Design a protein around this ligand. Structure first.
Ligand code: LDA
Ligand code: LDA
Ligand code: LDA
Lengths: 363, 363, 363
């Protein structure tokens, strides 16, 4: 295996773009939504926990997520990236770039939860939770889906983190919840997330090829379909579009297309944006800062609709051989369930530990 | 034709950077200029119409702009990108990346007009206009200049959208006009536009080659020459530089260099920044948020000065064989006129239709 | 020598990212720190002096920095980049891209000083200073370190500007000093600097290779180690972390890792973030907007700790042959001293000239 420099370049810029989604994307997104008295604190918890996620990733996270192991977790053979030679290639890029790319995804996922709960959760409790849930939920699920684990070895399609990122975080966010002051800033964070999101979606191809290209366009497309789906729905229900309505729409589409971008046709992308846009709207019409209402609802949707629109018939890249659409759909449904239930338990364990240790508070 | 992954990578990042110019670049630029009571609305119209432009592009825009057709428009053979195979190569990159790159340019152009008129134009009227003018002005002109059409087939030089983007939008903006509350935010939008602008200028080479490199440097250069041209002029006239004066200067240079970046020497870039900077200043001294004063004036200027500084004599890449500077200059002048008059008629038709349909308003 | 397009692409995006650090990164960073009545002015001086640095670079800066010359400065043979053929290759990329990359570094360095002193220094005095100090300090030191000069030809390790950028600017900032209103904005500027910083650190490899990959990861790593080092230290001393404490932490790590990113192991990166984080904290506990407290202190630290962690023993890329760690450490110490004293004299000459010309003021 030899590293292609074009792929190195692409994937290093993609990692930067995903890094950009957390710092400052998600921070500015929540920063404009939450009460003003809470913004600095929230900004601090996103920053400190990003730092944290970065460190646990390098120390053992990556090895556990992407080390060869069982169906559920990797190994502790790549502790602080050792026995990864500098010139070790994975795919068509240096493994170090995989390490950095994959860590940036862990980061935005944690950032999605931490920003939602920075208000109500006590700092030390968030840190405890983050450590628990990254280790026992993000990493194992990462392994199961992208790391050769249970779900991958069963044929699950999730190009860019419909389960790993979105459903996973949405359920974490809900268990927590269970247990807008600056719209310009909200828009900026949305804009930065959207731009950074191409690093995540396109870079999930691991190379600058026809598939990254496909992921890219499907992302422009489904983000736009969703925006208009939301906006029209909002104009139907509420009489007029709103800025927050437009930004939520975009996220609904970005979320919905996340599992699907690498597998579907643009026709399929557009239909996905549309449906995710409206389901997002319906979702928030029926949970901290609507974490689930958009990420949970839309993630489930994207994941299901991937096992439809991958069909070569519907302009998709085609299912694996011997895989009927019906089998793929069951496998999607299974992946979703396994993610919902797994992130749930772990979330509950995280929040409970934090609570029995420092208390969820705040004081 | 085989896709070069380095070019795929480059052009996918360039598209992201051009996407960044609209979301949130232009939005934040106007967001700080216009009255506060109008910002959210403007932010919403830029977002919703971006979504729209994205969708019309995928549906028929691209096929009409870059399909093989006549002198003026392409075909409806690539409706929803069909009969474009995934691995179809155009230039040295996948065609899908051309689709995404070219759509991001349509987006920033519409964003330039929509932001300027979000205040005074009624939403549904903007949408109607956008549809009319994208279809009948942006697309045909795109085709004429970059799509094998009338102006290209006559030797016009316009590397990165002096006519297609700037003059085109400036005239749209003027017909409309005919028919600063947050300078920090203005600066941020300027900064984001400038950074994103390298995707547009350098990526217009279609490859990561000596010409992209040339476009890049000419962009650093002419943006700086212009800033100082404006600033000094402002210090001469007004007694001191201003932040808005500095940001306008930058845009004057970015606009002025847009047609020229791929064809000229750095000596030529600097002279272009200087002249565009002062003409921009003179321009706004003598029209919504000075859309024309800078884009129209400076676009015309860049376009004219391209047919001078392309000269191999003046450090440029040289004119095509058999093309004297005098012939190039006439061809520039013709391209400008054709753009001014074409965008005018279409603009007028767009605004008139909107007016007879929903009314330009606002209520 | 033949240009690799993957490297062209990578380095053109890296330059964009470094450009992003100044416009708007550093501007927004200082913009939120300094008094509100001073923000627009500061924003204007960063913009105008960036423009300036861009122009002097193209005119003679690059030729003086990277032209073949003596130990201390290059030549005036590349005035306005002439006798640099368009297709001239340097390393594995077009020379034009080196020109643009290296100029973007000059820009962020000047931006670091100008933002710090925009308040207290008179405009014309800043301009005079900038011209003096860029020409006589930034350029010669650039030449000495990255341009084949005294320090390089003695084996100094400074991957990405520990002396050239950080110590150099910190001493300029101190001589000047000798002679927070918006924390959300501070965070945004920090975020943008951090993201842009990967262009500087990774792009300093000149290619998208295992070393750029190494630089990248070491950057994620040391920024995170530092954030937590600062944060814990701040929690130890002040009872709780703060947003500004978190952002300063990040910068401490980014600065500290700057010389080292291309030479060390991730184990070494983490230790560097930790130590730089605390030394930054200790630094500001014991100078405009703590320019030295973080850049001077942390730069010195990174530079020293590079001559330790480069050791192949400590997971580093190894010292040059015949170079013991002890010899490298002396060479680091010498590089630092030469930089501290050189930037000092020149700074003093710059400020003194400005003072005798227009007066440091402000009026
Ligand atoms: C592959 C993409 C991974 C990105 C993770 C999430 C980023 C978008 C977050 C937007 C938050 C919107 N909201 C309020 C519905 O949660
Ligand atoms: C190839 C570049 C295409 C970019 C289109 C326009 C972006 C810059 C817009 C700045 C608006 C400045 N103003 C007020 C003079 O219109
Ligand atoms: C290789 C990196 C070159 C970047 C130059 C400096 C950028 C960071 C500036 C942050 C300023 C922080 N502060 C207040 C301590 O000066």
């Amino acid at each position: 295996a030899v590293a292609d420099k074009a792929d190195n370049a692409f994937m290093m810029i993609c990692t930067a773009l995903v890094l950009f989604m957390t710092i400052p994307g998600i921070a500015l997104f929540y920063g404009g939504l939450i009460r003003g008295k809470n913004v600095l604190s929230m900004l601090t918890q996103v920053t400190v926990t990003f730092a944290l996620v970065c460190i646990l990733w390098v120390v053992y996270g990556y090895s556990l997520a992407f080390g060869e192991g069982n169906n559920f977790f990797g190994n502790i053979n790549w502790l602080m990236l050792k026995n990864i030679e500098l010139t070790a290639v994975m795919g068509s890029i240096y493994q170090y770039i995989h390490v950095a790319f994959q860590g940036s995804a862990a980061c935005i996922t944690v950032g999605l939860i931490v920003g939602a709960l920075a208000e109500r959760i006590r700092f030390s409790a968030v840190l405890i939770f983050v450590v628990v849930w990254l280790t026992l939920s993000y990493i194992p699920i990462a392994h199961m889906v992208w790391g050769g684990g249970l779900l991958a070895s069963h044929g699950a399609l999730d190009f860019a983190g419909g389960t790993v990122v979105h459903i996973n975080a949405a359920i974490a966010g809900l268990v927590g919840a269970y247990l807008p002051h600056n719209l310009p800033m909200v828009f900026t964070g949305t804009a930065i997330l959207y731009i950074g999101w191409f690093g995540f979606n396109a870079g999930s191809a691991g190379t600058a090829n026809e598939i990254a290209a496909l992921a890219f366009v499907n992302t422009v497309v489904a983000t736009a379909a969703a925006i208009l789906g939301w906006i029209f729905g909002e104009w139907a229900l509420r009489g007029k579009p709103s800025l927050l309505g437009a930004c939520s729409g975009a996220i609904a589409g970005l979320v919905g297309v996340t599992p699907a971008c690498g597998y579907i046709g643009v026709g399929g992308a557009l239909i996905i944006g549309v449906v995710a846009g409206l389901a997002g709207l319906w979702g928030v019409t029926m949970d901290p800062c609507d974490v689930f209402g958009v990420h949970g609802v839309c993630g489930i949707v994207g994941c299901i609709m991937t096992g439809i629109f991958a069909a070569s018939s519907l302009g998709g890249v085609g299912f694996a051989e011997g895989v009927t659409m019906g089998h793929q759909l069951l496998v999607q449904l299974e992946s979703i369930a396994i993610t919902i239930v797994w992130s749930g338990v772990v979330a509950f364990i995280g929040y409970k530990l934090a609570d029995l240790t420092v208390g969820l508070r705040v004081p």
